[PDB]
Design a protein around this motif. Structure first.
Motif, short mmCIF file in Angstrom:
data_model
loop_
_atom_site.label_atom_id
_atom_site.label_comp_id
_atom_site.label_asym_id
_atom_site.label_seq_id
_atom_site.Cartn_x
_atom_site.Cartn_y
_atom_site.Cartn_z
N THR A 44 50.70 30.82 44.81
CA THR A 44 50.72 31.80 43.73
C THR A 44 49.67 31.46 42.71
OG1 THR A 44 53.05 32.27 44.08
CG2 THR A 44 52.14 32.81 41.89
N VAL A 45 48.93 32.47 42.27
CA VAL A 45 47.89 32.23 41.29
C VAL A 45 48.12 33.04 40.03
CG1 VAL A 45 46.16 31.46 42.90
CG2 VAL A 45 46.47 33.88 42.56
N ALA A 46 49.02 34.03 40.11
CA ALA A 46 49.35 34.85 38.95
C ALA A 46 50.57 35.77 39.12
CB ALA A 46 48.12 35.70 38.55
N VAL A 47 51.25 36.03 38.01
CA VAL A 47 52.38 36.95 38.00
C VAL A 47 52.13 37.86 36.80
CG1 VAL A 47 54.87 37.22 37.77
CG2 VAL A 47 53.91 35.26 38.99
N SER A 48 51.99 39.16 37.07
CA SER A 48 51.69 40.12 36.01
C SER A 48 52.95 40.57 35.28
CB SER A 48 51.01 41.36 36.61
OG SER A 48 51.97 42.22 37.24
N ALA A 49 52.73 41.36 34.23
CA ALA A 49 53.81 41.97 33.48
C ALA A 49 53.91 43.32 34.18
CB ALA A 49 53.43 42.15 32.01
N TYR A 50 54.44 44.33 33.51
CA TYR A 50 54.55 45.63 34.17
C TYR A 50 53.24 46.38 34.30
CZ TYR A 50 59.53 45.31 34.55
OH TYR A 50 60.81 44.95 34.91
N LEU A 51 52.92 46.77 35.54
CA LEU A 51 51.68 47.48 35.83
C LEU A 51 51.92 48.70 36.72
CD1 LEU A 51 49.38 44.46 36.95
CD2 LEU A 51 49.48 45.50 34.67
N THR A 52 51.17 49.77 36.49
CA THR A 52 51.26 50.95 37.33
C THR A 52 50.55 50.51 38.62
OG1 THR A 52 49.10 51.90 36.64
CG2 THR A 52 51.06 52.51 35.34
N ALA A 53 50.71 51.26 39.70
CA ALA A 53 50.08 50.91 40.97
C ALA A 53 48.57 50.91 40.80
CB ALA A 53 50.46 51.91 42.05
N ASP A 54 48.10 51.90 40.06
CA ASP A 54 46.68 52.04 39.85
C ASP A 54 46.12 50.88 39.03
OD1 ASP A 54 44.80 53.98 40.83
OD2 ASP A 54 44.36 54.41 38.72
N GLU A 55 46.85 50.43 38.01
CA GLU A 55 46.39 49.30 37.21
C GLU A 55 46.36 48.04 38.08
OE1 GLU A 55 48.07 50.66 32.78
OE2 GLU A 55 49.28 49.41 34.15
N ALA A 56 47.40 47.84 38.89
CA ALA A 56 47.47 46.66 39.74
C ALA A 56 46.33 46.71 40.76
CB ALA A 56 48.82 46.61 40.44
N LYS A 57 46.02 47.90 41.26
CA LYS A 57 44.93 48.03 42.22
C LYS A 57 43.63 47.56 41.58
CE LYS A 57 42.36 51.31 45.06
NZ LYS A 57 41.15 51.42 44.21
N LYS A 58 43.34 48.09 40.39
CA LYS A 58 42.13 47.73 39.68
C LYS A 58 42.03 46.24 39.35
CE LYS A 58 42.59 51.84 38.89
NZ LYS A 58 41.83 52.52 37.80
N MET A 59 43.14 45.64 38.93
CA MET A 59 43.12 44.24 38.58
C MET A 59 42.90 43.44 39.81
SD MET A 59 46.14 44.30 35.84
CE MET A 59 45.75 44.72 34.13
N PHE A 60 43.49 43.90 40.91
CA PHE A 60 43.36 43.22 42.19
C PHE A 60 41.90 43.22 42.65
CE2 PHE A 60 44.95 40.79 45.38
CZ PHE A 60 44.85 41.29 46.68
N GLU A 61 41.28 44.39 42.63
CA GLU A 61 39.88 44.47 43.04
C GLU A 61 39.02 43.55 42.19
OE1 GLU A 61 39.99 49.15 44.44
OE2 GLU A 61 39.55 48.58 42.35
N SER A 62 39.26 43.50 40.88
CA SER A 62 38.47 42.62 40.00
C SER A 62 38.66 41.16 40.37
CB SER A 62 38.88 42.80 38.54
OG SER A 62 38.55 44.08 38.08
N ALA A 63 39.90 40.78 40.65
CA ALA A 63 40.21 39.40 41.01
C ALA A 63 39.54 39.06 42.32
CB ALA A 63 41.73 39.20 41.11
#
Length: 181
Positions: A44-63
């Motif tokens: 595990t490298v991170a645990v987010s707070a509440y994110l919409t699917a679209d926000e999680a997608k974007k953060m994922f691509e950036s990571a």
């Protein structure tokens, strides 16, 4: 307002094709002797707070784009005090391992948590100290060369996780991405 559903996501660094089966082998062996849920090896490298699917997608691509494949090294098989930290592989706190955690937490806008103790869990369970001490020894028995073992983390997985669900039933992988060498 468009996307209204939000979830907590966990971000996982996944072992390379070479080491994965060694890990699965050991996990399946230990959970068949100490009874616990089945789950894939991951760091595990991170645990987010509440994110919409679209926000999680974007953060994922950036990571995914801003993180290169790295490697982790097993220090020893250690044990914890609760369900998710039962028997796990304690990893060396190398710059690359610590930074991957730092950068993933940056991307998913994570809040201060506890010190990063990079590890690959081998068993999730609630055992007595004896049963715990026994599972640790057994890990070694099953794989005596775990100490010092280095493995490659070449993928990240975006996972919807009820970090408190002990059945792991709510645990679902959404997306996976290949990290560049």
């Amino acid at each position: 307002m468009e996307e209204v559903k939000k979830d907590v996501y966990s971000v996982w660094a996944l072992p390379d094709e070479e080491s994965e089966p060694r890990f699965k082998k050991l996990m399946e062996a230990l959970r068949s002797e100490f009874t616990g849920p089945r789950f894939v090896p991951h760091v595990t490298v991170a645990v987010s707070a509440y994110l919409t699917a679209d926000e999680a997608k974007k953060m994922f691509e950036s990571a995914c784009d801003g993180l290169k494949a790295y490697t982790a090294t097993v220090d020893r098989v250690s044990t914890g005090t609760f369900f998710f930290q039962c028997v796990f592989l304690l990893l060396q706190t190398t710059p690359e391992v610590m930074e991957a955690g730092e950068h993933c937490k940056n991307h998913f806008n994570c809040s201060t948590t506890t010190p990063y103790m990079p590890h690959l869990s081998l068993l999730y369970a609630e055992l007595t100290e004896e049963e715990k001490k026994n599972a640790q020894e057994k890990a070694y028995t099953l794989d005596s060369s775990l100490d010092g073992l280095s493995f490659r983390l070449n993928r990240l997985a975006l996972c919807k996780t009820d970090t408190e669900d002990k059945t792991l039933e709510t645990w679902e992988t959404v997306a996976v991405c290949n990290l560049n060498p």
